[PDB]
Subunit: 342 residues, 4 copies
């Protein structure tokens, strides 16, 4: 009997994980937020092995009711206010969902009598390293969060550890570095770039603005990373793992590579908030900088060391950066060609 | 200077209100929830409009938005608005619909705007619940029948308290059911219009409803948002019922909707075994499922909007037959594309 | 098997109810808030009583306590109960008094007790606020006048909804003001009785009040907790007004309290400049301070408890004159033994 | 102009800090929780001090208080501070100790005081939990072991974030265990000193503890509140460990406490069957009960306060033997005057 409950099933990762588990013959249950509009765009194609339940990580009673009904063998807590910039002005909501919500879900497991039968995956994050204390970052690198998002996720990381140690819950922290896809939220930098570049190629847009072009990230593909989540729950012992590519690129490079895929070479001029990216062939300005996209406390650099996962889970990243960029730009050209308002 | 802040701007009413205020030359600000996906479908055609991330459960974010915007008018339309869902999401519904109203009022006061802003609260005919008078007017005693109704009752009274304690210009719009082609799919009218449209297009054969005998006073959201604005143009802050005064059953909505795709529904059976059958073909198109019932139903609503007619010169423009036609025609076109 | 769970057990009413139920042979469990100091002063003489740490804002703790206790009766007396304080602690008051009632009801349902437990909600005459009928009875429309009243109104209706939706035996006790020697010092009656006692003993000369013209229906808490239990012994779950039906002003409470220490108060002046003077000595003993006023006052309350008299055979035993005497005498004895009490 | 706002003013540390700041001529404001009973026992002797009703879970009340007070210094001492209680009140503990710190910081920012106020956060050696280095210093990685520790870890980092993001002068005092005659009765040191005092006076025969082998670095709260003030006098906002660097077991606290009433405890048995017996009389005075154990214990703490010594000229003044003597003697005097104290 394999029965998964996914919080955050409507999100990027939840949508890939649902598909991954359905292919393995799991009964998949998801918690979906009530919305005034359709919010199941990423999973509607899966529509009798998936069932959706209304809930919220801020409502403990609803979590108990869902877990009691489902009796899952595996729980993946992917539900979160996941946007770092937004977390600065929605700090309390972010704490309540991403931090305290993790506690609520763990307490619901315990309340439902499932402490010995469920395996629990927590969606931890490279944001925990923030102002990185070692390069590269591994499981033993000390945490230094740099946003209300990071602080909330740090609470969640440690409350998970506490349920594991106090009550022998099989609970694990996936410390996942940035992962992207054609399903990535439009407000994250990679998808913002790929969508904008696609529109420029099609003549639907001339210019877009970014924040910090010099931020450096370790970017992988979400489809590869959800497999690691499942692998962590197949492990004999509950252990925490870094999941990452170990390769670093700047936002500036993401922009350059994205424009190359529509046949344009970006050339940079100016400094700081007056820097612009110009088409080499035509001289048209396609990229500007706006301070409103900066974070008050930036995370300048991330590079993950996934040695432990490679050795213990036989996990490896399959999609590299150049292919990730190509896939996202090509997907968004096709999306925007079919529908200019997409 | 006319600057409106709308909570619940992405919802049915918020989307119509935003258009209404933009046409009048308002600077319109909306509070939008962070979402993992696009959630601005009803208003994207408008983007004098600025959107701000926020949530009615986060007090600090509300203070920050109000301080930046300095609105002259606030419309609190943000809510977990589904009555059935409120029975299993009772605490979330309380925190958003009840305590969230307090948070927004306290944010106004914190920002020093108690004497300058006009505040509209989205109250509701659900406050009457098990109706104590027929028809219902402003002085009809409330009797809520769900966690939604209870939360909205808290909100109604905390608004009254800010008005009486601090002389805030704050009003309760006691709006009866209002619908549109933008209505959420999970409400009965849109569920019917979408399902009937799908049946016409061969995309569906049958759908299930709950209580076919529930009776409602149904108007058009576009008309009702105008009443909200009119309440804030009034010289004194007063509470108003907004309604058509005409009552129809869920069963009638179903019958009229099927007539618009050229089918006559004939009913047979009783209770949870009742079915609706096409007269011409004999195919079963409507069934009943107890899972769509509410544990405590609101059997009957009929609003008396005499006070609004006299003081605001408001009148509904869209009648029931036109509402049904518009919704069914819009969903046939939507589902075909 | 008679097992009661009392939220708000450390408060005035909880302390009397615990004693009342213990005398009947109940196993009594209470939920107590964590405090940096001793907070069990009203009940320490009782410790068949067990206390559990919890809070009406923490859903999981309520489920854990109910699962452990398996109560047959639940009395939800826990609340931020002070009306003036509710104006500056409006959200906390909503979360405890309103949403906390929902949390406790949801915990009952979660624990599988919807068909076995009887649930008492501590409703209040504050629901009537700007009174729509005189006297007020169960069918008088509510008109709350504070964040406290609004929160309690939510609680009243969510209790009704659990009763109607799920057949929970749940009732609203609509209790009018009730006092005792255990009343919180920040409520007007105890503030007066303590202050008058101190004046009699020479520990104080003068004290200030707010609105002297407010009128209340005042009974004794010990009588009223019996009505709570009687409501849960009823065959059907019904809501009841519990009250004396007799009205007095704050001014009268002051006058009667001073008479019990041998002084006649004579009033001069108006509004915030009104003062109460000893007739014999001319000393000023009572002044008025606007800081004790509420932004939206509840001017007048008078309860009609006909339904309780007919269905429960309940009647108030302590009348106003005896209530005042008891409170003043108790505080004279308290303050004589300990000037810092 | 020196105006301090203290959250948690009614607690052990708040009470000593208020006295310390008043002696320096500060205007002192405290946030006090509404309570059904008197809860200002530690500070009533001081009532320039002004108290305000509030709660760390109610953002609006914090903004109102800060706007009125316009403090130059804020000390966030308010918390559900009991580690054992945190396991069953995990969500409440998170909301108060974690999110409440955010609420107070956001209130500062909302009130326009981000550049003028100095903010002290009550961090804790519980952050080290399963200690990653011995001794623990500012750079020792954190490993919390309770819902209390996790909540405080959130608070530590949100304070750091306000400092780094908005240039708030905000600091984390990483204080190791500190005790006093005003320590809450539910903490191990005061539980022992009160119980030993009662045994000496014939009011008690025996008491039970949990883990006798836990090791702590114990100082005196009166010394430690001075460190809090010193951290806000520093030119740059820095985090500091404040500790004695000396370690003792719970067992040693018990032994030394009994020596002060003229008894030598001798231990026999193991685990939950271990007992402490008077050598002279053979009477059992100490037993062990598993209900006082924590699911995830913090076995050992020893702080290195080198940084504070060098930068603040702070040093602990009261050592362990004097701490124990003071607590036992204070509780003998307290219990002699009043057996119900
Ligand atoms: N993608 C990365 O690079 C990465 C790396 C490490 C960790 N993470 C973390 O990994 C998880 C998944 O990432 P993602 O990219 O898939 O995030 P995402 O696209 O933002 O998805 C977030 C999901 O959580 C849901 N959610 C938000 N608030 C909720 C609440 N209050 N109650 C219940 N559900 C709620 C969202 O629902 P709606 O659709 O209704 O908004 C959505 O389904 C998140 O926890 C994120 O913080 C992400
Ligand atoms: N339509 C009626 O017949 C009727 C009659 C009387 C009163 N009402 C009340 O009138 C108002 C508008 O109705 P409607 O039909 O437009 O409702 P709706 O379509 O369900 O819209 C609800 C709106 O509130 C937002 N919202 C929900 N939770 C929120 C939160 N926690 N913080 C901030 N915003 C939040 C929603 O955002 P998402 O889009 O992100 O979900 C959406 O914008 C509601 O208050 C409803 O209860 C409706
Ligand atoms: N007395 C009246 O005249 C009257 C009339 C009608 C209704 N009421 C209502 O009747 C009930 C009892 O009145 P009372 O005079 O006994 O009130 P009270 O003396 O103020 O007692 C309030 C009790 O509730 C507890 N409490 C407060 N906040 C709580 C929280 N967040 N979680 C759990 N417990 C909490 C208090 O604990 P602490 O001791 O820790 O503060 C105390 O035990 C209250 O609900 C009140 O609103 C009173
Ligand atoms: N003493 C130590 O060894 C030590 C070491 C490091 C850190 N700490 C931390 O240092 C601080 C002070 O310790 P302590 O020994 O003085 O603690 P304490 O005696 O338990 O004092 C706790 C204080 O916080 C208040 N409080 C609790 N919940 C609150 C809420 N929701 N809103 C506002 N105030 C609230 C309490 O009020 P009531 O009186 O109403 O309960 C009391 O004034 C705490 O943050 C503690 O966690 C202590
Ligand atoms: C693993 C981790 O991954 C994600 O967190 P993130 O790294 O903040 O992701 P992002 O795409 O928002 O920013 C990446 C970098 O790009 C910079 N950047 C420049 N210009 C813009 C810009 O215009 N928008 C955005 N969004 N970022 C920009 C920005 O300042 C930052 O340095 C989440 O999934 C999170 O949930 C998570 O856990
Ligand atoms: C004014 C008020 O208006 C709305 O509240 P509502 O009246 O509950 O709206 P509804 O469309 O969900 O139900 C109308 C009636 O139809 C019955 N009904 C039967 N069968 C199904 C059925 O299958 N689905 C639904 N949803 N209802 C059904 C159902 O039992 C009820 O009797 C909200 O906007 C609310 O926010 C608001 O304030
Ligand atoms: C039944 C009901 O009973 C209580 O609510 P309350 O009626 O507000 O009780 P109180 O003693 O605070 O006020 C009675 C009247 O006296 C006036 N008054 C004058 N001068 C002062 C004065 O100085 N202090 C106070 N506190 N009141 C004063 C004050 O303005 C009001 O009109 C709570 O147990 C509540 O939980 C509850 O449910
Ligand atoms: C610095 C830090 O300091 C305090 O946290 P704590 O160290 O947990 O304090 P405590 O006195 O509760 O426990 C000390 C040790 O004693 C053991 N122990 C044995 N038997 C009993 C017993 O019967 N009761 C208690 N309470 N502990 C017992 C117990 O298991 C633990 O190992 C708080 O001020 C906290 O807020 C804070 O931040």
């Amino acid at each position: 009997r394999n029965v998964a409950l996914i919080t955050g099933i409507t999100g990027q990762d939840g949508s890939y994980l649902a598909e991954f588990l359905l292919e393995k013959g799991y009964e998949v249950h998801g918690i979906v937020r009530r919305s005034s509009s359709f919010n199941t765009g990423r999973i509607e194609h899966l529509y009798g092995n998936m069932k959706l339940h209304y809930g919220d990580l801020t409502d403990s009673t609803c979590l108990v009711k869902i877990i009691n009904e489902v009796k899952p063998t595996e729980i993946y807590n992917l539900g979160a206010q996941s946007h770092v910039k937004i977390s600065f002005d929605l700090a309390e909501y972010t704490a309540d969902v991403d931090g305290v919500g993790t506690l609520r879900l763990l307490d619901a497991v315990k309340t439902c009598g499932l402490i010995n039968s469920v395996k629990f995956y927590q969606a931890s994050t490279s944001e925990l390293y923030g102002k990185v204390q070692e390069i590269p970052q591994k499981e033993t690198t000390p945490f230094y969060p740099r946003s209300p998002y990071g602080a909330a996720k740090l609470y969640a990381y440690w409350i998970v550890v506490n349920f594991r140690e106090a009550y022998n819950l099989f609970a694990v922290n996936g410390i996942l570095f940035n992962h992207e896809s054609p399903r990535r939220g439009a407000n994250f930098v990679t998808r913002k770039i790929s969508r904008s570049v696609a529109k420029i190629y099609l003549g639907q847009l001339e210019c877009f603005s970014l924040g910090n072009l010099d931020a450096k990230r370790d970017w992988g593909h979400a489809k590869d990373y959800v497999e690691a989540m499942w692998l962590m729950l197949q492990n004999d012992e509950p252990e925490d793992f870094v999941i990452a590519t170990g390769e670093v690129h700047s936002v500036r490079e993401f922009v350059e590579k994205s424009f190359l895929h529509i046949g344009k070479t970006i050339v940079w001029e100016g400094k700081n908030e007056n820097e612009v990216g110009r088409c080499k062939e035509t001289g048209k300005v396609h990229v500007t900088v706006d301070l409103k996209y900066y974070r008050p406390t930036e995370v300048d650099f991330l590079q993950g060391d996934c040695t432990k996962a490679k050795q213990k889970l036989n996990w490896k990243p399959r999609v590299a950066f150049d292919e990730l960029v190509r896939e996202m730009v090509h997907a968004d050209v096709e999306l925007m060609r079919t529908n200019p308002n997409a």
